[PDB]
Each structure stands twice: as structure tokens, then as C-alpha cells.
Ligand binder design. Structure first.
Ligand SMILES: CC(=O)N[C@H]1[C@H]([C@H](O)[C@H](O)CO)O[C@@](O)(C(=O)O)C[C@@H]1O
Ligand SMILES: CC(=O)N[C@H]1[C@H]([C@H](O)[C@H](O)CO)O[C@@](O)(C(=O)O)C[C@@H]1O
Ligand SMILES: CC(=O)N[C@H]1[C@H]([C@H](O)[C@H](O)CO)O[C@@](O)(C(=O)O)C[C@@H]1O
Ligand SMILES: CC(=O)N[C@H]1[C@H]([C@H](O)[C@H](O)CO)O[C@@](O)(C(=O)O)C[C@@H]1O
Ligand SMILES: *[C@@H]1O[C@H](CO)[C@@H](O)[C@H](O)[C@H]1NC(C)=O
Ligand SMILES: *[C@@H]1O[C@H](CO)[C@@H](O)[C@H](O)[C@H]1NC(C)=O
Ligand SMILES: *[C@@H]1O[C@H](CO)[C@@H](O)[C@H](O)[C@H]1NC(C)=O
Ligand SMILES: *[C@@H]1O[C@H](CO)[C@@H](O)[C@H](O)[C@H]1NC(C)=O
Ligand SMILES: [Ca+2]
Ligand SMILES: [Ca+2]
Ligand SMILES: [Ca+2]
Ligand SMILES: [Ca+2]
Ligand SMILES: [Ca+2]
Lengths: 390, 390, 390, 390
């Protein structure tokens, strides 16, 4: 058959550069003739030959008559959709995979696994699809909005790993990982460590032995929960990132959180999903991260890197590597993903750039992509170009 | 060349869950830019890799100018169309297969067979297409709206099997089954038993030896005619389902038809096509059924199951298995179908949810899908989200 | 490689039946959201696995602002376009093959040959394309609107044959045939016989040795020029059809043309392209033909057949085989084509049903298809369902 | 896996003829229902089976609300897009490859290489994509709008070759050539000779040993810089074309620049990218060129040819070969490209026909194609048919 995917060494390069903007609402004017779907939580996942751009639609287009409710996060209508990356996600270009108000997907080398959560808040349900077939489900364990990554899951040798979580958005949400093979859950992994609130993990392969994830703590801290999952033993441990460059939003000033690495610090309530991707070299690992320019608002997006070290213990500041989105522009969720070149993997970060005009109008998003590309420094930023009044 | 398809054991699971909603008129607003087709009698059929979503269109779109007459069932413009399941059935996404006002389709492992009926009411005509080619026809034998299933036909080792019927919607309509191989009728099967009125059969494989169908009696009863068709001898027998949980609409109260399993009972006149799909386990057979929540109107849809036994002799109540559509939402035709996973088949029930505003406006339908996945209880219902005034 | 196509015996059957209507302008209302292309001269040609529906577009859609000039036949904008048969020919569904105001195309088993004529009236040019590549041209020989079939060319063992003509529409237009192999003209065939005016031939295979064509005489007669082209010797002879059932429009009353078979008769000025297709049986050949219901106007369409005999000498009336389009509806150009089933060929006739509101509004066409299908008699007619005011 | 592509001898033919018009704004009327993209710098490149039609979009459609700024050349929204040749480039038909305000692409027999330039004017960046993956970048070396061909790059045995340039549009812009293999730059080529200003080179293979390019000098002359690049030694030399038929716009009268082939002459300032394609015969080489009909404005387009000789030393007038676009119609950039027939290559010239209404309205372009086919003289010209007021 095709063989299973494994993480490979990253393609050569040392800086990210602006790759691609998908801005569907550049075609959504009342006087235009297009039907871009109203979405949020976009992410990209790639198989050997193509990438798919996923998002959770509100099952409504612009221009249209169903803008009310598109700023809510969960309802009976939201669906996980995709287009081939490079296509504009319209009503006719998109594929509707399953009813879901939280999602993930990934390719294992042979087929696409799609993951969607729906159901009532107190009793939601993870549903897994392998290709066309619905293959398995997993139930709410803490009865308070069972939910998942909003970014790609990760497969090695046919085994795919997925973060799920359940619990209060302003209290305890202890995550678990599911190990999924051909669409069926073959193991539950219960993490150890600093486990009181971990959600929306952005995960990737640090090597063939370790998946690492930079997650969101929506309750207690502006430091990101950082997971290290050993794939050989199927065990996970979580501790907060110690870097003084706090990656959440909102957050206090860099380096202002006093005390040991594990200290929670101030301005911990609230959060945002954060970009994280690995650059695997023969003797060095680069960890690339994105955070908003604003410490309190979803505005702007800049890139940081650090090579080697241990995220759990290094207090050192990360190295600023370029402004991807200016302060002037929306910088909402961000995520990592890798494109498969012929012999090596290309690390990328994608940025959700939400068009927010409040509850009174439509609420949707463009997706900007920056990838590791050549050398030098990052040269240009992204704007959506959308005027929400048209 | 490809192997012929056979029924396989069903994938593991014990409950159905909400899978997917195709709601094309969420995009039909007069201020939007899309062209969802106006349709009724949707159904889905799957081949080894892909499923198609079929329906009978009135050859008109919303927004548009041809709404008048879209609440009629037969005319010279209706056509059988399909799209790949998960796509939206618009003017450009759809393929028009043949002129037809009653239809069916199925894949035999190698090619699609498409069936459509058209012609004048008193002398209509079954037409069969195998791939791109028109291959055969079957004539009216009762000269009173020759018609067929409005759901998937069923193929085993290249032989595909199809219910047709002809006769008065208010009296006698004896059905027949056609055995079709590579688009040509190779055998006609004349059933035995209770044959006074059988139409709109929803059929599936109980095993490699038997096809069973839950059908509609539009004239005499609210119990469903239940066909057992022996594929090895090509013989069929029909008797009424004996369960007190009457599956037709309209219907009397459950358990109220006194007398032997064959008693017709009250409120027999009228009917609806009903969902039915098999869960074939190694030692046992689950028969899954759907019926409207209202006893008299096409509103709501509930799921029921019974393991093993004989539908013709068992008076036992079917086990209520969850609300798919609440009573506030339309619940019109339902149908069963199976998705082919790698090693096993996934049973699903699809629900036609008609937007009915009467004859003064457009008349069309959303399709909701529920499939067997995981364990537990069915968790969430389906709404169309459509406002017919927009 | 794939092997070359040859005509095979026709699939079993004895009557035609309504197969499919493509009516693009059912979606062209000013308040709808679609873009059907404005076309005329549709025809269908099929390869082993699929059929393409071709037409000459005016490079304009409905609704739109370029309706002026769409009732003219030749200009700098007209293009040969196609869609897969079954798709609606819109701006986004269509492929634009080449600039052309007269066309033909056919598949040889390995690739599509597309043929288009354009250039000034006094000096037009046949251009041939094989797949994507432009491969050859042929020049005007009588300098007065060099033109071709408006229907499929015909390939046997890799050699494709095409009628072209040039000359006065109301005088002499002596046709020639080109023999084309992999897109290049390898022979010119100059017909013998009754050669003064032959245009718009509808041609098909009577056997592996003979192509026959029923053509239009726009100047001298209402009898159709009937070509017999011997494929083994590459010679052609033309004589008028002798049947008293005159197939052109306009025409006198059947059987009113006195004198020998070759007599021209009255009402010969004007003409229409006519449907003709072969049903090849082991010991018998059926010639199926279509003509308008009206003797003088492009209204209605009925089917006729005759088995065996010699068209050049049989004065006998053809047998009426059904009304495909009532007198009430447009019946403009018609054409034959064959769909390839697995082991046999299916003969079909397609009918151009032009929406004519005069020079003041848009002018375009729907395409109706009738194919040999089963037995009995033809049961239903086709309407476009279009209101030209919307 | 597939063989690498090499140039082959051209298909037989001695004249170019009108092939195809892609005029997307024939569908852009405010009362229509389509979304043609706003674009400039179209070009076409072909692989063994298919050609793509590329362009640089302003990420806006007609009808729409983002016309302001579509007459500017560089900004943060322009993207390189393509569709399959023959399709219309709308929002939904197109694929967005990468953010870019200057581009090129070519197929090497195995995969597509896509090149785009973006970044700030003083520090822009070549980015290269091979298939789906971003693989390499090249930095600005003169810090003054690094930019590239706006037409196909050229590959031979896996090595693809690309002109880039950087420097003042009013002064010195020394070009360089990049040798790219599987998306990565493996050699930089620094030309010799007359190097003061070369940009927008249109390049093709004169043979397996030499790539030649006719380029634009925006500063000093109306004669075109002509590159001869030796693929075996990877060296290049540039000298001005000596023909009296000056191919740039603006230009003085033909033959008016007195002095040796290197004299710059008058009206050197300004320029236009010009069409150029090779016809490689067994014993001889045809060089086909296009230039505007007006000497000063981008109006009309005429075809010229010269067989053999040396472009650097030959003062001879080129042979006028027909009017492709009359003086009444726009004639802006032109480019050469080759279509792969089964055994030989078909040379073609494409013409950008811009709809220019000034900065107060939309600014976009039709693409007209002429290719070598048959013998005789070029017969018909191309009009866009677009009314910019609709
Ligand atoms: C499943 C779900 O509701 N997810 C939502 C999450 C959660 O509210 C928080 O992660 C707290 O758990 O946050 C979003 O609100 C947000 O910040 O933009 C969007 C997302 O849809
Ligand atoms: C071929 C045909 O007309 N079928 C129609 C059937 C028949 O009327 C009944 O089955 C009685 O035979 O019922 C429908 O009316 C209905 O209940 O919604 C829809 C369907 O189109
Ligand atoms: C190439 C060309 O102009 N063809 C046109 C022909 C010729 O006028 C006649 O065949 C006489 O030669 O007739 C049509 O007019 C017609 O009757 O509907 C349509 C077609 O486009
Ligand atoms: C990268 C870039 O800006 N290219 C632009 C070039 C340059 O201005 C000139 O070649 C001088 O370098 O010219 C155009 O202006 C022109 O003449 O139509 C269009 C093109 O977009
Ligand atoms: C991972 O393992 C596979 C073999 O199992 C190997 O080909 C690949 O290069 C390894 N990747 C890394 C990053 O070590
Ligand atoms: C039906 O028969 C085929 C082989 O003929 C077998 O592979 C399949 O598993 C059988 N299905 C059932 C339900 O037993
Ligand atoms: C035509 O010839 C081929 C072999 O050359 C044969 O297979 C085919 O059946 C023949 N068709 C007819 C109608 O005789
Ligand atoms: C170029 O070389 C290839 C093999 O390397 C050959 O097949 C091809 O015909 C040559 N082309 C020309 C123009 O000579
Ligand atoms: Ca936080
Ligand atoms: Ca579309
Ligand atoms: Ca009933
Ligand atoms: Ca005539
Ligand atoms: Ca110049």
C-alpha cells in the first residue's frame, strides 16, 4: 500500500517568510457574486502530496442572511469543512466532513483522519472519521465542553495522537491524549505533571520518539503548558514553559513573573491558541513560536525562535524573528503544520486573522501562512485587505 | 478489474450519532450568491471509495423564478441528479443523470447503476443506465404510476436488486423485484404472501442470503410491509411487520391494532417512506428503524432498534434509541444506507427534512445523516437552520 | 497504449426513449445566481468512458449585458466549448477549446480531436487540435464560408473522417471529406455523384467499411443529400435520399415530389441540420432519422426509422417512431451520436431546442437526448421549461 | 518516474493562426453572476499533458468593491494564481500559489516550479515553490525592486533556468540567471556583454545547447537586449538585437537608429515585455517576435519572423507576418510558450490585452493566443469584446 508517514529532517533554511494569504472575504461584497463561507478556527494539515485547509464553518456565506450567531462558538449548525490549500473556501469549493464545533485532522500516509466534537456542553462527543467512514467516538469525562486542538493531529507509523480536554474554561481542564489507528482509539494517555488546565494544544514531532505541544491555560497563567509525549512508551508529562517571553494573550510584561519556572504569575485568565512548529536538524532542534504583538488584545503576530535547551527550565528570552502581522491587523489563533517536500519537511505557521465587527455583523477569518524559506531575515507582513462594510 | 461488492459484517458500535447535515438552502437567500437546487426524495448510496448524494430535482434553483409546480411529484422536467456526498447540490456541483420523477441507484463494486422512471402516469417506464450508457427499460404492468424505491438498490456479486411497483396509491399496488446485472434486467421476481400494497421499499442485506425491506402501504395499514428476498433462489415473500411500534405516518397509537400480526388496523390510508438499515454482527442482527415523532404529520424523527427475532411474528415494542429530529423540525422521507470502511460496513440512516411553505413558494429539502458510531446513547438532534422567508 | 475505437454492433433494443434534457437557461433568471453560456449548434461526441457536450458559444452568459449579436452566426468571439455530458454548460463548468464559428470533434480511442472554423467569410480556415496541441489547418477552396458539420466526426482504427464544405448558401457548395490521423490531414476525398450542394452532414458508421451521412441542401431541394463513404478505398458518392418522407425543413408534403429519385422538387431553398444515427445489427441495419413536426418552421421533432434497403432508391415512406418534441416547442438542429457501453454501442439523437425571442433579446438553446432503450414504443416528449422573460 | 523534459523539434507549420481568447471580463457585468479575477501579467507554461494559465491577481473580482489600487504594480495583496488553460480564471476556478507581485513558472517533466517575488521595494525576495513545498529564496542584490520574467522559466533535463533583475527602472539593472533543480538554486549565472539594463526576459530554447531571450530595456534603448545562455557551460552573454524592426514600445521609426548594432538610439526610455518563441527545424531556426502596432502606445500587436542568422549582428528588417490585434484594441505584454504535441513542440505567442480605464475604475486583462499551425498567411485578428462600463 502507500507507506506510513514519519517526521523527517526539516528542509534547509533559517528564517520564515511570507508564503500565502487565503482571504475569502476579499470576494464577499454585497455587490460581488461570490459565496465565501463564514468560518473560524482554520488550520492546515498535509499529506505526502497535498495540504487541506480546514475550518469550522457556521454553515453560512457572505453576503447572506444568517450573520446572527456567527460570533458564538458552539451550536447545532457548525461543521468541519475543507478545501485543497490554495483554493478559496466557498460554498461550492468546500467539502463538509461532519457536524462539529471543535476539530482536528491529520494524514497518516495512507488516509485522512477527521476529528469533530459536537453534542450538548455537558455531554459532548469526540467523533472520528477515517476517509469516508465514521469509525469511533469518545465521551465527555468531566462534562464541561469536551473539546480538542483546532489544529492538526500527528501520525507516526500509522499511530495518530490527539489532545482532548474537558473541564471549566475558568477552572480545572485536565487534558488526555488519544492514540488512534485507522480511525479507532487504541489507547488513552493520562498526562502527569502540571496538569490543572491544558487546552488547544498545538503539537508536532520533535523527533521519532517525542511529540511536543505548546498549549493554552485559559484559567491560571499566561505561560503555555508544554507537553512532552513519549511515543515509544505512550506517556505524557506537562510543565509550564519557563521562558520569560510569555506566549499567551493576555499576558504581563516579559520576565515580570517572579519565582521558580512553575510560578503561575498574573494576568493568567483568558488565553489564545498559539503557533508552534519544530525545525528538526541533525544535531539541533529549533522551536518556532508565534504570539500576538499586543499583550492584551488579539492584534498583530510576531515570530520567535529558540534552538535546543529544555523549555521547562530555560528562563531565557526567545529570539524575536520578525513581525508577521502588524499591530494594526487582527492576530487571533495560530498553529503549526509541515508541508512534505520530496526528501524533507517544511515547517510553517498559519495565522487566523479574524474580521471582528462585533455581534451585530458577520464574524469570519482569513488565514495567513509563513514558512521556513531560505536564509536572512523575515521581510514582509500580511494584511487581510478586507473592508467589513462592503 | 475490481472485485464485485458483497455485504460484510458491520463495524463495531452500539449507538447511532449525528454525523452530517447537508442543508443547501442555508445558501439560497435572495441576497446571497449561490444556486442550491430544488429537490425532494434524497437518498445516498456508496461504492468502495465514495458515496453519492442523489435526489430528484425540479430543475430549478433558489433564488429563482420557477418555484411554481415544485410541490408536484411528477412532470416532464424532474431529473435524477447527484453530487459527491459532502458537497453542496447546486447547479454547478451536480451531475444530471436522466429525466426521472422516481429513482434509485447503487454501485456493484465496478460501476454505478442509475434507475429513473418517467413517462405519462398511465404508461410510465423504468429506464436503467450503467455508467454513461442507457442499457434497458421495463414497462408499466398495472398502468398506474410505475415507480420505485427512492433509495439505494442493492448489489451482491454483480447482481443488483430493485423494488418497483405499479397500481393505485389508494388500492392495490403489487410490487415486483428486478434482478439487474451490468445494467440489464436478467430476472423478474414476483413476491408471495401479503402483496396487496407495497411501495417505496427501503432495502438492505440481512446477510449474503437475504435482502430485507421495510416498505410503505399507502392504502390499508400503518404497519410496514416487510419483504424477505432470498438472493440464492430469487424468491420473495412479504408480510406486515408485527411490532406494536407502527412505523408509518399516519399511524394509530402504539399497540392499538388488536388481532394477529396481519390485522391492518386503523389509519392505514396515507404513508411515508421509512428508514431501515442492518447491523450485521457475527452472531446477531440489529434492525434499525426511524419514524416521525408526530403520529399524523411529517414532524420529528426518532430512532428504534430490535436485535434478532422475526419482524413478521414479533409483537414486541421496538427499543427507542434517541431523537434525531425534534418535533419542531420537518421529518419526511428516511432511508438506510451503508458506508464501506476498510474491513467492515457502517450502517447509517438519512432523513429528508423538507422546507414546506405550501404551493405558493419553493419546496425543497435538507438531508440529515446519522450513523452507527461508538457506544452510549444518541446525543444531539438536527435542525435545518433555514428561514424560508429569506 | 489504449487501442483505437471501431464501430461495434449496437446494444439490443427497438425503440428510442427520452433520456436527458440539458436546459441551462432554467437557471438564467435575472434574480438567480447562475451563469449559463449563450450557445447554439450543440452536439455530443463520446469516447470509451465519457461523453462531452459541445456547443459554439457567443462568449456571453445569461443574465448579462452582451445579448446583442447572439442571433448572428459568425463573429470574432464565438468559441467551441465543452462540458462533460450531464453538467450544465456555465462559465465555470465549460472548457474553451478554440476560437470557432463552426465545429466538430470526435474521440479516436486515445485522444480528442477538436475542429473549429474561423476567419473572414471569404477566406475561412479549418483548424484542428489533438488534445491540447494545435496540429493542422485547411484553407477555403471556394471562398465563401468554409464550414463543417456541427456534429461529431468519426474515427475508425485511428483515422477520423470529417465533412467540410464551401460555397454559396443559395448556390453551389460542393463538400469534401478530410481524413485526419492524430490531428493531421492525411487525405482529401472529393465525392462523386449529386454534388451541387451538400452541407452540415450528420455522419455515422453503417459498418467497418462505410460511413453514411444525411446532409442539408440549403439551395435546391428538401430531400437530404445522402453520402456513402467507403473507408477502405477513401472514396465518397452522394445522391439524394429517395424516400417520400422528406427530412429537410422547409419541405413540401410527403410524396408530392414527382419524377425519379434524383428530382429536386419544390420548397428546396432553406434547410436545417438533421438527426441521423445507425443501429447496426448482425443481419440488419436500422437507419434512424429526425425531422421537424412543422413543414416550414423549426417547431417540434419526430423520429422515423427504416431497416435495410438503399436510401438512394427506396421511395417508401419511413416509419414514424414517436414525437420527441411537440409542435408547441422549438425543434432546431438535430444530430446523432453513440454512447459506448461495455460491449456494444448505444445510438442516440440529440435535439437543439432554441430559445428564440428574436434579435432584441438573448438567443440560446437547450439540448434534449433520446436513445435506443428497450422495446415497445416511444413514450414521452421534451419541453425546455424556460420562460424567456425571466 | 517521468522522464525529464527536453526541447524537441517544432511541429510542421509555417504560419501562426488565431487559436484562443480567454476574456474573463466578458462575464464581469454588474448584472451578471460571475467573479472573474482582476489580473495583469498573464503568461502560459505547459507540461507534457496540460498547460496552465498564470497571472498576478490583485485579489479582487469584477463586479466588486476593491477596484481602487488595481492599477498599481506592487502591494501586499498580489498573488500568483493559475487555472488550467481553457478555463475561466474566476475566484473559484483559480488556485492561489503564493503571495507575489512578479512571477514565473515552468514544468520540468516531473513537477511544477513556481516563482514569486514580494517584499518591500528596497529589499524584495525571490521565493521558489516546487509542487506544494516552499524550497528556497534569493535575496535582492541591488536593493531596487528585485523582479523576474512574467513568463515561463525553461527546464532541460531537470535544470530550470530563470532571469531575475534588480536595479533602477530608469538606470542600471544588471540581470542574473538562476539555475534551479527541484526547487533549489544550484547556480547563479552572471552575464557578460551589454549588461547595463535587462528586464522581463522572454526566454526559450533555440536548441539543447542554448536558451535565448528577447528582453526589455526600460532605460536606454528601444532595441531589445537579447540573451544567449549556454546551458552546457552555464555562461551567458547579452547584446542588443541589431534588426531595424525595433521591438520595444516606445520606439523610433524602423531603421532610424544609425550607427553600429550597439547604438542605443532614441526613445529608449520606457518599454514593454515582448513576445518571442522559437521554431526549431532540423536544419534551421525560426525566431518569431511580436510588437505593438503603435510606436508609442500599447495598442495593436503584429507578428514578425526571421529564419537563422545572428540577432546580434543582423540589421535586416524582420518579415511582417500578420496583424494579431488591430490598432483599435489593447496590445500590452506578450510572451512566447510551447505546447507539447505527441512527438513535437508547438510554438505560440500569447498577448495580454489590458482593459484600461485609468485609476478610477478596475484594471485587468484578456489573454489572446496565436500558435504555429498549417501554411499560408495569418487570417484573423482578436478583439476582447469587453465594454468596461457594464
Ligand atoms: C470548544 C469551544 O467553545 N472553543 C472556543 C474556545 C474556548 O472558549 C476557550 O478555549 C476556553 O475553553 O475559545 C474561543 O472562545 C476563543 O478564545 O476565541 C474559540 C473556541 O471556539
Ligand atoms: C412516483 C410518485 O409520485 N411518488 C410520490 C409518492 C406517491 O404519491 C405515494 O407513494 C403513493 O403512491 O408520495 C410522495 O407523494 C409523498 O408522500 O410525499 C412523494 C413521491 O414523489
Ligand atoms: C457557418 C454558418 O454560418 N452556419 C450557419 C448555417 C448556414 O447559414 C447555412 O447552413 C447555409 O450555409 O445555418 C444556420 O444559419 C441556420 O440555419 O440556423 C446556423 C449556422 O451557424
Ligand atoms: C515588478 C514590477 O513592478 N513590474 C512592473 C514593470 C516595471 O515597472 C518596469 O519593468 C520597470 O522595471 O512594468 C509594468 O510597469 C509595465 O510597464 O506595465 C508592469 C510590471 O508590474
Ligand atoms: C524517523 O524514522 C524513519 C524510519 O523509521 C526514518 O526514515 C526518518 O528519517 C526518521 N526521522 C527522524 C527525524 O529521525
Ligand atoms: C459475504 O460473502 C463474501 C464472499 O462471498 C464474504 O467475504 C463476506 O464476508 C460475506 N458477508 C457476510 C455478511 O457474511
Ligand atoms: C469492426 O472491426 C473490429 C475489428 O477490426 C471488430 O472487433 C468489430 O466488431 C467490427 N465492428 C462491426 C460493426 O463489424
Ligand atoms: C534534445 O535532446 C533530447 C535527448 O537528450 C532529444 O530527444 C531531443 O530530440 C533534442 N532536441 C533537439 C531540439 O535537438
Ligand atoms: Ca492564560
Ligand atoms: Ca461556481
Ligand atoms: Ca399507511
Ligand atoms: Ca433545402
Ligand atoms: Ca525601452
Amino acid at each position: 500500500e502507500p507507506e506510513w508517514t514519519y517526521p523527517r529532517l526539516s528542509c534547509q533554511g533559517s528564517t520564515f517568510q511570507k508564503a500565502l494569504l487565503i482571504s475569502p472575504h476579499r470576494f464577499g461584497e454585497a455587490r460581488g457574486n461570490s459565496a465565501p463561507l463564514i468560518i473560524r478556527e482554520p488550520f492546515i494539515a498535509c499529506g505526502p502530496k497535498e495540504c487541506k485547509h480546514f475550518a469550522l464553518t457556521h454553515y453560512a456565506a457572505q453576503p447572506g442572511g444568517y450573520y446572527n450567531g456567527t460570533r458564538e462558538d458552539r451550536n447545532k449548525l457548525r461543521h468541519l469543512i475543507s478545501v485543497k490549500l490554495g483554493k478559496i473556501p466557498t460554498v461550492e469549493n468546500s467539502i463538509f466532513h461532519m457536524a462539529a464545533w471543535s476539530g482536528s485532522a491529520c494524514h497518516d500516509g495512507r488516509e485522512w483522519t477527521y476529528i469533530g466534537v459536537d453534542g450538548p456542553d455537558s455531554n459532548a462527543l469526540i467523533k472520528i472519521k477515517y476517509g469516508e467512514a465514521y469509525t469511533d467516538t469518545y465521551h465527555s469525562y468531566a462534562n464541561n465542553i469536551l473539546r480538542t486542538q483546532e489544529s492538526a493531529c500527528n501520525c507516526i507509523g500509522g499511530d495518530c495522537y490527539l489532545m482532548i480536554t474537558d473541564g471549566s474554561a475558568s477552572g480545572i481542564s485536565k487534558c488526555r491524549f488519544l492514540k488512534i489507528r485507522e480511525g479507532r482509539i487504541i489507547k488513552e494517555i493520562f498526562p502527569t505533571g502540571r496538569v490543572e488546565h491544558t487546552e488547544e494544544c498545538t503539537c508536532g514531532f520533535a523527533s521519532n520518539k517525542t511529540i511536543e505541544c505548546a498549549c493554552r491555560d485559559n484559567s491560571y497563567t499566561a505561560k503555555r503548558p508544554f507537553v512532552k509525549l513519549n511515543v515509544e512508551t505512550d506517556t505524557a508529562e506537562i510543565r509550564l514553559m519557563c521562558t520569560e517571553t510569555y506566549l499567551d494573550t493576555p499576558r504581563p510584561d516579559d520576565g515580570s513573573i517572579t519565582g521558580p519556572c512553575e510560578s503561575n504569575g498574573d494576568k493568567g485568565r483568558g488565553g489564545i491558541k498559539g503557533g508552534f512548529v519544530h525545525q528538526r536538524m541533525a544535531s539541533k532542534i529549533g522551536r518556532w513560536y508565534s504570539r500576538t504583538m499586543s499583550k492584551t488584545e488579539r492584534m498583530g503576530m510576531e515570530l520567535y525562535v529558540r534552538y535546543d535547551g529544555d523549555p521547562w527550565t530555560d528562563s531565557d528570552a526567545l529570539a524575536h524573528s520578525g513581525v508577521m502581522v502588524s499591530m494594526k491587523e487582527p492576530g487571533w489563533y495560530s498553529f503549526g503544520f509541515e508541508i512534505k517536500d520530496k526528501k524533507c519537511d517544511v515547517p510553517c505557521i498559519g495565522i487566523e486573522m479574524v474580521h471582528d465587527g462585533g455581534k451585530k455583523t458577520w464574524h469570519s477569518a482569513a488565514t495567513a501562512i509563513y514558512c521556513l524559506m531560505g536564509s536572512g531575515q523575515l521581510l514582509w507582513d500580511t494584511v487581510t485587505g478586507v473592508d467589513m462594510a462592503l
